[PDB]
């Protein structure tokens, strides 16, 4: 009985593979052979932020690309001002171990979570002028990996157990449960039009969820190890995934298969964060050798290197406007890089 | 304009006050000691917590030194992802049931993974081999469990240097030191980092485990300071 189900699943997997192979017509690397190369990218650090006194796991640029909130293991949530290097707020957290943060699109709330299996939201606009916990979101079993504000009222967060959830701050309880993964859901990235999102887990696969309907649509099993980072192409029809393979890969939803791979011979250590430039050409990728890289997303040729960090680069964010690039690391320094010519 | 200057100055005060708060918190953070209670299964984690929603905390201070006990119980079985979060702790108190399947083999396969992790290679480990009385009863009962789950046990003699047992069974002492040697040889196999292992024998129910933890933490701090000064 169960063997029949296994055979059926294998047959459907073979059908999917054959359909993908048939749909494969050309190669992005083959077709990009006539494009003008980007060339060397010079990126000198502009601001260095030294308020933190413990390693940094997550930072998130604000909606206006000026304020950035960063989280450290010392139980602090500092909201910086990138231009003037000032700190606008510092929030002491209940649990020292936090693995994520999120700055709301409206700029009102801030999220945070970690090994406490709880997501905590700190509204920054109060009459008393105090950053108090607006709401606590409990219901997850494992640790809380990533949380991303879908709006000022909803939030999608992915936990250690094979389950994501679409919450609701007004009432506090889950609205939709996104089950189907096999390992720890390490990363999560919403769409530019907040219509879909991808949850890259540790079973070396990524799914595509539609928030309103609440069921998976596609599965991309290109990788061969745990997926640590994920990020959509600014168009919204492609995404890049980082893994412990030391290789990023570029998928497309419509083609339902990979496009090209950014593997390099001299890279052995895994990838922590992956992000795109505003235009989608450059592909930043933080590595464990403590040296963020820049990749030509159309040619898999390294353009520049954002060297300068003592420890592993745990976070990597390109501003919503596209100007700066902030790279926090485990040495507790946030550096705001920029381009010049 | 004057408005921009006023806003910038107000931001300056705000930054100064926040930095003063951070400065005050820095002393507390650098003074306290963080310990991760990572025990395999039910080997005495609850009773060790008693003697000293996902994560649990106890803020106990001993000999004018503060401590944190991080009992990460309600997490998932898999440990390869959130255990990198604990590479900044001073010590990883490890608890082993030295009495379903081979629990000692699982304990060893967890200890050497902890030892050889490229991020935890700088973090020291403290071993508490629980259930000494249970092991004594099992050995004196003529039960062939360790003797046939570890073939190498037969060709083993009690180490001469350490034998503080007043009247305990020589075979029980041999089993205790065999398991200690197993863990210690795993620890000393690879010296790719700057971490050490302190294996104890948690048998007494008095307030002696806390004293042992404090002594080992002082040893770890002194070792890291001496290495930082290049004296060691």
């Amino acid at each position, epitope marked *: 009985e169960l063997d029949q189900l*296994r055979q059926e699943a294998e047959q459907l997997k073979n059908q999917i593979r054959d359909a993908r192979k048939a749909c494969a017509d050309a190669t992005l690397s083959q077709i990009t052979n006539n494009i003008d190369p980007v060339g060397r990218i010079q990126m000198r650090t502009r601001r260095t932020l030294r308020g933190h006194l413990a390693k940094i796991y997550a930072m998130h640029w604000g909606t206006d690309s000026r304020l950035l909130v960063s989280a450290s293991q010392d139980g602090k949530l500092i909201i910086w001002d990138s231009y003037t290097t000032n700190k606008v707020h510092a929030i002491p957290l209940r649990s020292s171990w936090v693995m994520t943060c999120a700055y709301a699109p409206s700029g009102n709330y801030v999220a945070c979570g970690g090994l406490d299996n709880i997501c905590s939201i700190y509204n920054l606009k109060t009459r008393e002028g105090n950053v108090r916990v607006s709401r606590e979101l409990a219901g997850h079993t494992g640790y809380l990996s990533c949380c991303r504000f879908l709006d000022d009222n909803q939030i999608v967060t992915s936990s250690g157990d*094979t389950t994501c959830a679409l919450w609701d701050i007004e009432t506090g309880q889950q609205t939709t449960t996104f089950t189907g993964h*096999t*390992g720890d859901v390490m990363s999560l990235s919403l769409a530019p039009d907040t219509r879909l999102f991808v949850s890259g887990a*540790c*079973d*070396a*696969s990524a799914k595509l969820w539609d928030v309103r309907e609440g069921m998976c649509r596609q599965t991309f*099993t*290109g*990788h*061969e*190890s*745990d997926i640590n980072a994920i990020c959509f192409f600014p168009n919204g029809n492609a995404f890049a995934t980082g893994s*412990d*393979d030391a290789t990023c890969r570029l998928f497309d939803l419509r083609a339902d298969q990979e496009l090209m791979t950014y593997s390099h011979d001299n890279i*052995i250590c*895994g990838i922590t964060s992956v992000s795109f430039s505003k235009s989608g050409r450059l592909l930043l990728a933080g590595y464990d050798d403590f040296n963020c890289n820049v990749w030509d997303a159309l040619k898999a040729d390294r353009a520049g290197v954002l060297a300068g960090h003592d420890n592993r680069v745990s976070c990597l964010g390109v501003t919503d406007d596209g100007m700066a690039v902030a790279t926090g690391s485990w040495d507790s320094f946030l550096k705001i890089w920029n381009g010049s010519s | 304009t004057e408005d921009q200057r006023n806003e910038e100055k107000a931001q300056r005060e705000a930054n100064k006050k926040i930095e003063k708060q951070l400065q005050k918190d820095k002393q507390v953070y650098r003074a306290t000691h963080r310990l991760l209670l990572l025990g395999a299964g039910e080997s005495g984690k609850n009773t060790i917590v008693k003697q000293m929603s996902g994560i649990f905390e106890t803020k106990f201070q001993v000999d004018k030194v503060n401590f944190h006990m991080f009992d990460v119980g309600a997490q*998932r*079985d*898999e*440990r*390869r992802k959130w*255990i990198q979060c604990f590479n900044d702790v001073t010590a990883i108190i490890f608890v082993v049931a030295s009495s*379903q*399947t*081979n629990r000692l*083999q*699982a304990a060893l*396969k*967890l200890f*050497d*993974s902890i*030892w*050889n*992790n*490229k991020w935890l290679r700088d973090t020291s480990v403290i071993l508490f081999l629980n259930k000494q009385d249970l092991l004594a009863e099992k050995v004196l009962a003529g039960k062939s469990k360790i003797e*046939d*789950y*570890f*073939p*190498e046990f037969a060709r083993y003699t009690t180490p001469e240097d350490a034998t503080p047992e007043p009247g305990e069974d020589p075979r029980v002492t041999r089993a205790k030191y065999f398991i200690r040697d197993e863990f210690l040889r795993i620890s000393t196999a*690879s010296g790719d980092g700057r971490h050490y292992c302190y294996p104890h024998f948690t048998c007494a129910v008095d307030t002696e485990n806390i004293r042992r933890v404090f002594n080992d933490c002082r040893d770890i701090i002194q070792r890291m300071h001496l290495r930082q000064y290049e004296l060691l």
Partner: nanobody
Framework: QVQLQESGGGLVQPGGSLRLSCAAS????????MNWVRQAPGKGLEWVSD????????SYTGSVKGRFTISRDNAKNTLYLQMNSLKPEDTAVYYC?????????????????????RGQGTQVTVS
């Protein structure tokens, strides 16, 4: 995608011999540490052996030392376990696991009930 599927298995008499082969076709076989895992019919998952990236560092779980031999063929993308002189206690459901990250000398989460990089069941019975 890793697609770990073993072979061999069946029923043998006590003191017999068996030959289990593991086939991997979804990753670079030579950059990963491959280790066998067995699960008793009633008990939990139990680590039994392993093999290093090149095939130099080999360890066993005790009570299998000298009776079980593990080997790998990087070119053929196959992993072997030559098991000899069986006992009625050796019957289990052997799984061909795989450490999660490459170029690393440790791997956690191999003896867990929800691990994603291990094969299906290969029933081995001794009567």
């Amino acid at each position: 995608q890793v697609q770990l599927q073993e072979s061999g298995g069946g029923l043998v008499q006590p003191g017999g011999s068996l030959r289990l082969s593991c086939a991997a076709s979804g990753f670079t076989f030579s950059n990963y540490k491959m280790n066998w895992v067995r699960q008793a019919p009633g008990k939990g998952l139990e680590w039994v052996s392993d093999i290093s990236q090149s095939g130099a560092s080999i360890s066993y779980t005790g009570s299998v030392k000298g009776r079980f031999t593990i080997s790998r063929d990087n070119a053929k993308n196959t992993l072997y376990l030559q098991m000899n002189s069986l006992k009625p206690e050796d019957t289990a459901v052997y799984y061909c696991a795989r450490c999660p990250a490459p170029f690393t000398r440790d791997c956690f989460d191999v003896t867990s009930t929800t691990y994603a990089y291990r094969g299906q069941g290969t029933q081995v019975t001794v009567s």
